[PDB]
Design brief:
Chain B: It comes from Severe acute respiratory syndrome coronavirus 2. Chain B: This is Spike protein S1. This is part of a larger assembly, with 6 copies of chain A. The first copy, chain A, is mainly α and 338 residues long. In chain A, 51% of the residues lie in helices and 5% in strands. In chain A, strand 4 and strand 5 form a beta hairpin. In chain A, helix 2 packs across helix 12, helix 10 packs antiparallel against helix 12 and helix 11 runs antiparallel to helix 12. The two termini of chain A are 13 Å apart. Chains A and B meet through helix 3, strand 2, helix 5, strand 3 and helix 6 of A and strand 30, strand 38, strand 41 and strand 42 of B. The structure holds a molecule of 2 linked components (NAG-BMA) (5 copies) and 2-acetamido-2-deoxy-beta-D-glucopyranose (12 copies). The site of one 2-acetamido-2-deoxy-beta-D-glucopyranose has 3 residues of chain B, from loops. The site of one 2-acetamido-2-deoxy-beta-D-glucopyranose (NAG) has 3 residues of chain F, from loops.
Chain lengths: 338, 621, 177, 48, 48, 39
């Protein structure tokens, strides 16, 4: 499930009128057509911050897995964090991070290598050349891993009690017995087939890793979100070479070629073109942000339901009789293991 | 209301020069000057304005007296002390109620402060004043309104400014105004109680952008910061041969309009002062480019079409026109990028007994598509006869522009030469005599490479520019790399400094200390820029060394890094959160604490069972 | 806003210019105000859709939390939900989720099953909990120990398949009578 | 005439509306009246 | 409950310029103001 | 980059007339002509 997209703080003044005082004066005749856009983008960014907060920060206390890992034979190493890795992420979380490529990381401070680009400057440097910047998420992709690890450790050592009040420890076989009792099968089934259930769970956990490894793109939703962001931004930046019915598309060329009282016509034409393009971008971004809000509210209620307890709702927490679910952090999204 | 205005104001906490008296320097006048003085009863009469203050330029005099004021706009000579000695070409005298008002409560302690501001926007001399009893023991810090008295259109040039003294048997507070955005608080009764600048302090700027007087705790994005370029680099081609405009304007046999001579201008430096020299100009209509800005653009090719033509057809010659010449002899393109030249010539196209050498066409089968020559002698068909000859219904195509020294201006032998340009992305060869400056790398500079204007930072590169390659771009069609015309090397182009400034403050009801976060920029870049004074932001927040922080979201200025962890109050970005915490109070930056660090006691056979319970009522809105 | 016109007052411009040339400024003003009104309408539509989502969530929250007990976690506030009470607010609603939150806990002991005579005993509902010396059966979300009798536990097993089984005696009220 | 829908042409300021007496605190140099959204609210009578 | 609605794939090029080459050339000066519309409608249809 | 251009080009898998020599007919010129010869 997607949880958030890239945050942008587009600057209308620089985007429309690159360091041109006459163009700024002309744009001042259009009223607050810029403050509205800045407010909308800022609201989107703060909203998406709130979105990640809602999705992950569901636990006030950070739990940590016990030093020894023997949960009745159930093998949890694949989703438990790996101390060896510098990023402290589980192997299943690492594949998701590796299979998603972000066009703009944002937390790069890429200024300083536009001169150092040597080859043709890339899309990010081009965007920086024309007034479009990307803010980084408030919650780092490392601290989100801490949140996910806490949520995972709380649901395999304390059952669902840590989702309601104080965390009460319970052995994993008994937690499994109670999850079984929640669907109408008695605990004697588990206490008699414990080894077989452990082997089935281990095999399933092992085989989903290869299913994600070998598939072309099972993360297609997150990749689609990223692609839509990058493609909308590129379509925006491609409008700076459209004449919009003017003599030329370069404001610096036009201001240096025509004296102001005639040039103002071409400047006004460019103003109307770029303002309308920016309005289109802002409207589409608002619609996409609302869609992402809907999807990530679904993700938040799914977390609180399937992770913090057992859900009686059919098919909501995966197909079949739901037992548990383990959250996994993904770039700009979350992955559930029903 | 909290109305926001942009106008010439006195900057807050600015420099004001305090004088004394016991000779009268002429203070400069520019964008208006703020004046103030404290005196017991009266020592200042008036003020003198103008340029050069002599009997050669119109001047001003605002001299006050006991009962009226003696405003006039005149051309005095001098007094050097009865304040003028010349009123020769002088009009516009004005007299009204006196500006000075002095009141005392039976004591001389009430030294009322007299405040004055003058400005000369589009003439229309504005004079504003206010007398406040705040006594003048110190230049006070309370807010004082200033109301206008008179507003009159001098419409003259003012650069210098002087003052007048009185006789007898600590003043002169002078300030200078600048164009600033101001946010003024209007009382319920209409007076102005409070006002704050928008280009003085970061908190002031946030207060401007969220127009109000109370700024709630949080982080506010206000504007962007840009490193304005230091130097201007112009690198024109390596050619110095003057263009042959001399040889096309020195001609003696400018061909007729029916056969427009077309010369090509290439591989030369184009200075248009030589165009101005050989031209008693009559028609300088330029369409593609402004004639004044003609030396600063590089043209891929220049065409010079010249032909003698009558007076009215000069007005005919223009993009998108009509007439026997604009239809059958010479049609300019509708999207013409160029300029036209026309100066009268009655000395070379005229002689006694007359001259009829010139020619023009009124008879053509169809209109002339633009920039086509149609030299041909075919008799225009009339009716349905294949007639080939002269006479009725058999008309010769081209007629004569006979020119003699005695016609009207509408019939005089005007000389017309047009200049055709092409300003697109191509390796330019012809442009102005602008000198080629040096090249400096790794610094924000305005480059003018071969007519390609822009700004940014340039350095060495490792492209593989093919011999014909000149420019560089990206999938977004933006100029990336340029080849040096006089060095033949490759340089990349950088954004100037584009970023965005966000101010981190607690509530103003708590404190006024603020933090500045420059988004997505290495903090060494802003530090050197702020040291060289090349940052567009004019609010310079202090940097004491202990308040610097390279965040993943940019760099933070004004708060120090504490290594502790708390639930934070102001999100910043990338796991860093700022807060107003006691030391005795300051703003601190720390990484988020996700919560209490707790460890469960999971075991093979241990269970924790709650022996008690509580009832809690939460709220959802 | 002038929108690139001579002035931003229709009543001024109409009385200042004769129509054949006034129409240029008027058309500029329509071009500006129409686009501003379109922007306002678009933002209002988006906000209306968001408020639709919020109001549908509020409606299902009312019908679930108020008109019954919800088994969904955290949906009716944090903790084991008991009830809720609606309150009217200007352009909104305020819910008062009354929830049961557990409290002080004690670490005792647990065994998956109890082997009395070659048969594993499992609690019908609850946990086999041991004080430390005498095994007991109690509920889940509260501590209420009881003597292990044959009615609190159902028996099915062979005392050889369950892991962690702890020996104890189970009682029956039938042999005594 | 007050308290009636009339077209006013106050000193060249065209418009329509209903006018009446007020308790403003117009300073001597004040001539017009506006509001927070920059719309002409109150006018000073040239002849009274 | 509504489950879906009609899928449309309007064509900007002719909808604006009915088989007119000059109009198509002039529309080409407005940039990718059409590819965006086609992509949005196609995404709507696929989502439907 | 995958830059897309609209300009006069030789069509792919188009008709190309191969001549010989051992007289030199004039070929029409229109919108440009692609010429090639091996020697
Ligand atoms: C839990 O599951 C792990 C799977 O990642 C097991 O790790 C394996 O270790 C072997 C070497 O012993 C590797 O060859 C293999 O690729 C895998 O990484 C782990 O042993 C297992 N632990 C238990 C207790 O079942
Ligand atoms: C606006 O102007 C009103 C009229 O002068 C003021 O009302 C007056 O208030 C004084 C006391 O200051 C009374 O004595 C007098 O009778 C009258 O009511 C009003 O205060 C003023 N408001 C301001 C200055 O904020
Ligand atoms: C469970 O917790 C209750 C409070 O949450 C306890 O009630 C308290 O009773 C004392 C008197 O003993 C009061 O002083 C106090 O205000 C509160 O009402 C209750 O006793 C406790 N019970 C157990 C078994 O722990
Ligand atoms: C095991 O649970 C017993 C509850 O029945 C506790 O025994 C109690 O002990 C008292 C005397 O100490 C008896 O009078 C009472 O009838 C009861 O049997 C016992 O404390 C508990 N053991 C532990 C270790 O908690
Ligand atoms: C529970 O009690 C059983 C008898 O009441 C024990 O069975 C015994 O097991 C031993 C070997 O451990 C045998 O030698 C003996 O014959 C008898 O079968 C059982 O072990 C015991 N379990 C525990 C965990 O104490
Ligand atoms: C005013 O002038 C003094 C003396 O030059 C200087 O120290 C001070 O900084 C000036 N004020 C400001 C605000 O710069
Ligand atoms: C002051 O100036 C006025 C201007 O007309 C003049 O009439 C008057 O005589 C002057 N002197 C005094 C004392 O008022
Ligand atoms: C006023 O100006 C005119 C301008 O030519 C000049 O001729 C005349 O002498 C001037 N009058 C004076 C100086 O009294
Ligand atoms: C005003 O005087 C200044 C100072 O000489 C000069 O630079 C400027 O061009 C003058 N302007 C006019 C309009 O006379
Ligand atoms: C033409 O050339 C002669 C040669 O010296 C020169 O004197 C004259 O000024 C030139 N005239 C023009 C219009 O170039
Ligand atoms: C430019 O001209 C100078 C002067 O002749 C010469 O020394 C230099 O080599 C030239 N450079 C190029 C690139 O032509
Ligand atoms: C930005 O970060 C630091 C601080 O300036 C320095 O290494 C250099 O300027 C930049 N480094 C990189 C990797 O961009
Ligand atoms: C305290 O902060 C400093 C940097 O200010 C850091 O280097 C150090 O590791 C911190 N100490 C602890 C115990 O976190
Ligand atoms: C639980 O039992 C396993 C195997 O019997 C053992 O490895 C582990 O250390 C035990 N843990 C505790 C807490 O008793
Ligand atoms: C029970 O004892 C263990 C042993 O240290 C402890 O870790 C756990 O917190 C205790 N549980 C309680 C006091 O509820
Ligand atoms: C307007 O003029 C008339 C006629 O002199 C006079 O009676 C009236 O007082 C004047 N009103 C004002 C406000 O000047
Ligand atoms: C090239 O010419 C041949 C012979 O006329 C013809 O068969 C072939 O189809 C032509 N190529 C194409 C692409 O039409």
């Amino acid at each position: 499930l997607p949880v958030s997209m890239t945050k942008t703080s587009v600057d209308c003044t620089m985007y429309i009128c690159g360091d041109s005082t006459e163009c700024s004066n002309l744009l001042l005749q259009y009223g607050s057509f810029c403050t509205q856009l800045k407010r909308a983008l800022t609201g989107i960014a703060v909203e998406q911050d709130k979105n990640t907060q809602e999705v992950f920060a569901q636990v006030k206390q950070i739990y940590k897995t016990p030093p020894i890992k023997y949960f009745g034979g159930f093998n949890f190493s694949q989703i438990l964090p790996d101390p060896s890795k510098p990023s402290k992420r589980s192997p299943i979380e690492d594949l998701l991070f590796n299979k998603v490529t972000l066009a703009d990381a944002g937390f790069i401070k890429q200024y300083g290598d536009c001169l150092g680009d040597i080859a043709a400057r890339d899309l990010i440097c081009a965007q920086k050349f024309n007034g479009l910047t990307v803010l980084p998420p408030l919650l780092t992709d490392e601290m989100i891993a801490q949140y996910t690890s806490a949520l995972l450790a709380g649901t395999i050592t304390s059952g669902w009690t840590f989702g309601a009040g104080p965390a009460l420890q319970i052995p994993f076989p008994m937690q499994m017995a109670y999850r079984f009792n929640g669907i109408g099968v008695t605990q004697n089934v588990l206490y008699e087939n414990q080894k077989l259930i452990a082997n089935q769970f281990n095999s399933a956990i092992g085989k989903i890793q290869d299913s994600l490894f070998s598939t072309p793109s099972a993360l297609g939703k997150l990749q689609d979100v990223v692609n839509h962001n990058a493609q909308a931004l590129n379509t925006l930046v491609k409008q700076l070479s459209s004449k919009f019915g003017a003599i030329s598309s370069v404001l610096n060329d036009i201001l240096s070629r025509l004296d102001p009282p005639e040039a103002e016509v071409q400047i006004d034409r460019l103003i109307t073109g770029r303002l309308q393009s920016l309005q289109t971008y802002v409207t589409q971004q608002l619609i996409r942000a609302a869609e992402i809000r809907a999807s990530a509210n679904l993700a938040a209620t799914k977390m609180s339901e399937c992770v913090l307890g057992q859900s009686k709702r059919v098919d909501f927490c995966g197909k079949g009789y739901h037992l548990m679910s383990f959250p996994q952090s993904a770039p700009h999204g979350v992955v559930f293991l029903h | 209301v909290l109305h926001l205005t942009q106008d010439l104001f006195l900057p807050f906490f600015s420099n004001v020069t305090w004088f004394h008296a016991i000779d009268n320097p002429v203070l400069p006048f520019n964008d208006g000057v703020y004046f103030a003085s404290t005196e017991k009863s009266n020592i200042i009469r008036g003020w003198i304005f103008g340029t050069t203050l002599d009997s050669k330029t119109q001047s001003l005099l605002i001299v006050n007296n006991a009962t009226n004021v003696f405003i006039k706009v005149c051309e005095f000579q001098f007094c050097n002390d009865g304040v003028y000695s010349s009123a020769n070409n002088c009009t516009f005298e004005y007299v009204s109620q006196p500006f000075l008002m002095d009141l005392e409560g039976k004591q001389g302690n009430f030294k009322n402060l007299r405040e004055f501001v003058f400005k000369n926007i589009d003439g229309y001399f504005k004079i504003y004043s206010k007398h406040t009893p705040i006594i003048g023991r110190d230049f006070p810090q309370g807010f004082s309104a200033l109301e206008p008295l008179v507003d009159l259109p001098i419409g003259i040039n003012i650069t210098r400014f002087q003052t007048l003294l009185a006789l007898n048997r600590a003043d002169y507070y002078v300030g200078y105004l600048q164009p600033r955005t101001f946010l003024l608080k209007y009382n319920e009764n209409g007076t102005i109680t409070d006002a704050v600048d928008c280009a003085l302090d970061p908190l002031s700027e946030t207060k401007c952008t969220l127009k109000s007087f109370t700024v709630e705790k949080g982080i506010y994005q206000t504007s962007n910061f840009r490193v304005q370029p230091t130097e201007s680099i112009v690198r024109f081609p390596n050619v110095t041969n003057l263009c042959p405009f001399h040889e096309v304007f020195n001609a003696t046999r400018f061909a007729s309009v029916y056969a427009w001579n077309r010369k090509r201008i290439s591989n030369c430096v184009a200075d248009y002062s030589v165009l101005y020299n050989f031209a008693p100009f009559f028609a300088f209509k330029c369409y593609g480019v402004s004639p004044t800005k003609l030396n600063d653009l590089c043209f891929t090719n220049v065409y010079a079409d010249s032909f003698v033509i009558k007076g009215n057809e000069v007005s005919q010659i223009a993009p998108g026109q009509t007439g026997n010449i604009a239809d059958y002899n010479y049609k300019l393109p509708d999207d013409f990028t160029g300029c036209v030249i026309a100066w009268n010539s009655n000395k070379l196209d005229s002689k006694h007994s007359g001259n009829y050498d010139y020619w023009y066409r009124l008879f053509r089968k169809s209109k002339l598509k633009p920039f086509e020559r149609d030299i041909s002698t075919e008799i225009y068909q009339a009716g349905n006869k294949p007639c080939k000859g002269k006479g009725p219904n058999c008309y010769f195509p081209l007629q004569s522009y006979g020119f003699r020294p005695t016609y009207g201006v509408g019939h005089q032998p005007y000389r017309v030469v047009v200049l055709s340009f092409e300003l697109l992305h191509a390796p330019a060869t012809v442009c102005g005599p602008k000198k080629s400056t040096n090249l400096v790398k790794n610094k924000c500079v305005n480059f003018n490479f071969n007519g390609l204007t822009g700004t940014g930072v340039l350095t060495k590169s490792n492209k593989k520019f093919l011999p014909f390659q000149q420019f560089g771009r990206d999938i977004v069609d933006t100029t990336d790399a340029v080849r040096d015309p006089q060095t033949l090397e490759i340089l990349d182009i950088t954004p100037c400094s584009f970023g965005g400034v966000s101010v981190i403050t607690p509530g103003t009801n708590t404190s006024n200390q603020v933090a500045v976060l420059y988004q997505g920029v290495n903090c060494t870049e802003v530090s050197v820029a702020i040291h060289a004074d090349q940052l567009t932001p004019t609010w310079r927040v202090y940097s004491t060394g202990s308040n610097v922080f390279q965040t993943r979201a940019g760099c933070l200025i004004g708060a120090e890094y504490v290594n502790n962890s708390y639930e934070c109050d102001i999100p910043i970005g990338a796991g860093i959160c700022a807060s107003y915490q006691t030391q005795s109070q300051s703003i601190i930056a720390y990484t988020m604490s996700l919560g209490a660090e707790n460890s469960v006691a999971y075991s093979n056979n241990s269970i924790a069972i709650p022996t008690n319970f509580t009832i809690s009522v939460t709220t959802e809105i | 806003s002038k929108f690139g016109a001579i002035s931003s007052v229709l009543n001024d411009i109409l009385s200042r210019l004769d129509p054949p040339e006034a129409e240029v400024q008027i058309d500029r003003l329509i071009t500006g105000r129409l686009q501003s009104l379109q922007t306002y309408v678009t933002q209002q539509l988006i906000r209306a859709a968001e408020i639709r989502a919020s109001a549908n969530l509020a409606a299902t929250k009312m019908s679930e939390c108020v008109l019954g007990q919800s088994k969904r976690v955290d949906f009716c506030g944090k903790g084991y939900h008991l009830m809720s009470f609606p309150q009217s607010a200007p352009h909104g609603v305020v819910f008062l989720h009354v929830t049961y939150v557990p409290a002080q806990e004690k670490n005792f002991t647990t065994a998956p099953a109890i082997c009395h005579d070659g048969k594993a005993h499992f609690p019908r509902e609850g946990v086999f909990v041991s004080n430390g010396t005498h095994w007991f059966v109690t509920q889940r979300n509260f501590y209420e120990p009881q003597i292990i009798t044959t009615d609190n536990t159902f028996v099915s097993g062979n005392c050889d398949v369950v892991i962690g089984i702890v020996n104890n005696t189970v009682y029956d009220p039938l042999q005594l009578e």
